[model samples]
Target chain A: SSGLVPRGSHMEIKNGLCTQKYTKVYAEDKEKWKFNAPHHFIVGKADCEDEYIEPIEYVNFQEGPIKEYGINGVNNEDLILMVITRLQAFQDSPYKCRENAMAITKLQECLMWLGKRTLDREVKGIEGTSEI
Target chain B: GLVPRGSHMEIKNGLCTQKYTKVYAEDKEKWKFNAPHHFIVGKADCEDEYIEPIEYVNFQEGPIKEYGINGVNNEDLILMVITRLQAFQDSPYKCRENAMAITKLQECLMWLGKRTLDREVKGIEGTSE
Candidate 1:
């Protein structure tokens, strides 16, 4: 997975990753993410009961899914949500202005587009998918 | 952290299509847009991260260089502008002038963001047989 390039942005969209077990590891049970070794790979996990042991650490949205990691468990909307959360602070930062605020709003509009796709996916007990 | 490995993504969804709306007041109200300007920064935030201010590189030291991960990009630039102007907006010392100027500056930026997109082939080119 580290060596090969994915074919597209669809990159199968994944989450729950714990890359190589480095020389040392610290799991943030509260954050459910880990810091590994002198070379820190932010481990991703949704639960405290386990260390994030999933494969494929960095998800390059362009290249498509990690053939290396056996799973594509995360949704794109969720990933975007994570970004919105991390950036939530930027909203109130003194640096806020009409433009960057507009930028932030656009990020939510993005969710609207993706959310529409999600809505479509749940219809009729069937599922739909895309890079959205 | 393990270094990001890849041949690089020749961007596809790199453009944001939305446009900003201006107030354009009829108070003979100033509506002037500038051409080029230096971007503002979240110096305090960067300082908290031990990122000291340095020379702003107007030109690349080289091409295909691994920017960000160690440096910044247009996305980060936009983020900086957000926080930078927000400070101006939230400042206790009120100034409608600052508001107007920042709006024009950001308006230019939003247009520029869209403008920078696919000025080439209008989108990613196909790789085919």
Candidate 2:
């Protein structure tokens, strides 16, 4: 009886190890993707049971995923959408104009920073894998 | 060679130099009198003129006269008006708030530069004279 374990139990153990390995690989992949991505950082949870966090802030299109997509080398459409959406959102705000202006400035700076970093990353190879 | 110089000719010469000299003296006096002074660069003669240019030169309060006199500071008033005009004129057009804010910031910078220049001038005066 002690000579060999059951086939089903061995298979289950093997499958569980495989799942764990894949999980680590997938986690690393996601971490790398996010580390390389350009966007605002926020920390929040959508569900009590879920371990993952949600992004509460909007990312500037210039620095975000839009840059990877082909569109005039700049995310004009996203920016326009952002502007219009923001305008609508703050249409009734007391200092809408001033607040929108500051927001727009911040967005523009983010885009510029993303553009510069993208260029830098393209030129320099990826470095250490630590998430700092 | 005097065929009879018209009063017009004499008046023209006197108007050119004498009026300015008189105004200069009066301007100085206004300083002492504490009256307002407005300096209009151009002038017009209302005599026999079908159209008189508007009176741009006006003194609400006369110009300052003596140093110790309780006179209004016409120079200070003029400077204030000029600075205000410059501020408004240099301000950005009514565009997006972003653009407008940038323009306003630039205008403020210009004002700072002017103030700095004035301080430098005052420092030089204090040191040299």
Candidate 3:
């Protein structure tokens, strides 16, 4: 494990190439296009004694009133993960710059904001009927 | 349908209401979102007509910070984002990671707040604001 976990499977690094072995337990749920966040997380190595890492937030196009928008996908959360993974890769590459770090911070906002739809609000969509 | 749908609206004293109409998700899921046309009360709209749903924002967003002549702000923006991140504390989801992220953002804002536009460098030498 290069301290990375792929969604819906356990990650194994063999010959320095990662392979994922899917878990049958969740295979059926995935087939139905359901989603949930993994409990564990990987904290990156850093100069400081303690570091923080966030687990992937669960995002599903298959659940809730999400269908109202008519978009569909089984691995929607993967969208954010890919960008985040690519952005952080910049930090490790020779091209590392201030913007890369700033981007990673911005993604955290995306993660929080996207997964936050489950909450109720003092607001809602337009009403059923109106005079004019 | 005279006022139509999917544009931001303001409800002044007559429409003293706030809302997030034209509401949409980036991914277009009802679950994930943004409303570029955020509507807050204190503006005029459709007196005889009805503003279907007013968006939920804009009056005091960013705490209406004063970043001075440049019209920019530091701690103010970071602080608001921190407020969103902080909401996760004590949540069903573990917040250690969120806490860690929050702490780092907090530190950056602290430094930024210290860096007045008059003296854009910090941990500095040979200058005084």
Candidate 4:
């Protein structure tokens, strides 16, 4: 299906349809200067040789810590995990302290945005989706 | 009565009308943080002991062009400028003074990088060059 693909993967647009051509498998654990894959614009079909499976699953849709109620109105395990990832990335980066502070300020704004949404569904998160 | 004690020093307004008080000596060679007692608000008169002659007030006419494109292209300048700006976030000068100065400098550098390096490089034959 149309979703994220490996970094070197190319897409061909034929007869108003896009087909992804996987050139190489991307290492999900490896940290690169840029994102490892291109995000899906519209849901379509995958034409790869084998079945595509997500490498890692940080959030569980059914019974994760995120679904459980915590100190706040709704449990913020996802938010906490997101903040931890953000801070961990910040620490790994050469730019820390002030950059981290700016990132955190934007993170708070993103949480506010997510909190306001009425629809309850599986939310696929993106890294650095919030501008710093 | 105020006298011209240093270069570019002038006496425009009377001491009674001026809304500044002196806490320490005015030193031109030092930064604002080091010269903490230079000036303050609420003073009656320009007594010699309290008020020193106004020194050179630095002014900028247009966009700063001193830093070359290569200088602005680096990440260090942006980082340093942002770090300096953050330092004033919790200070009294957050709204009025130091914050504005640091932000202006940061903007200037970013604009310079965009105009000089980014556009020029995009026009090149190769993307990585």
Top candidate (TM-score): 1
lDDT of 4 by residue, B1-129 (tens): 354333221122221112222222234354222211122121224554443422211111122243211101112222322333343354432433334444444443343344335446678321223
DockQ values for all predictions? 0.02, 0.01, 0.03, 0.01
Q: Distance (Å) between predicted and true CA of A51, model 4? A: 2.9
**Each model's C-alpha lDDT?**
0.28, 0.26, 0.30, 0.28
What is the DockQ score, from 0 to 1, of model 3? Answer: 0.03
User: Clash totals for all models, in order?
Assistant: 13, 17, 7, 2
Q: Model 1 chain B: which ten-residue window has the lowest total lDDT?
A: B18-27
What's the TM-score of every candidate structure? 0.29, 0.20, 0.25, 0.20
lDDT of 3 at B98: 60
- Among all windows of 10 consecutive residues in model 1 chain A, the one with the lowest summed lDDT is A32-41
- What is the overall TM-score of model 4 with all chains considered together? 0.20
Model 1 misplacement above 4 A? A1-57, A60-70, A128-132, B1-129
Better of 2 and 4 by TM-score: 4
| Tens-digit lDDT track of model 4 for A74-132 | 11212222232334444455534444454444434333333333112225342112211
lDDT for A88 (candidate 2): 33
Distance from true location, Cα of A32 in model 2, Å = 6.0
Which one wins by lDDT: 1 or 3? 3
Ranking of models by lDDT: 3, 1, 4, 2
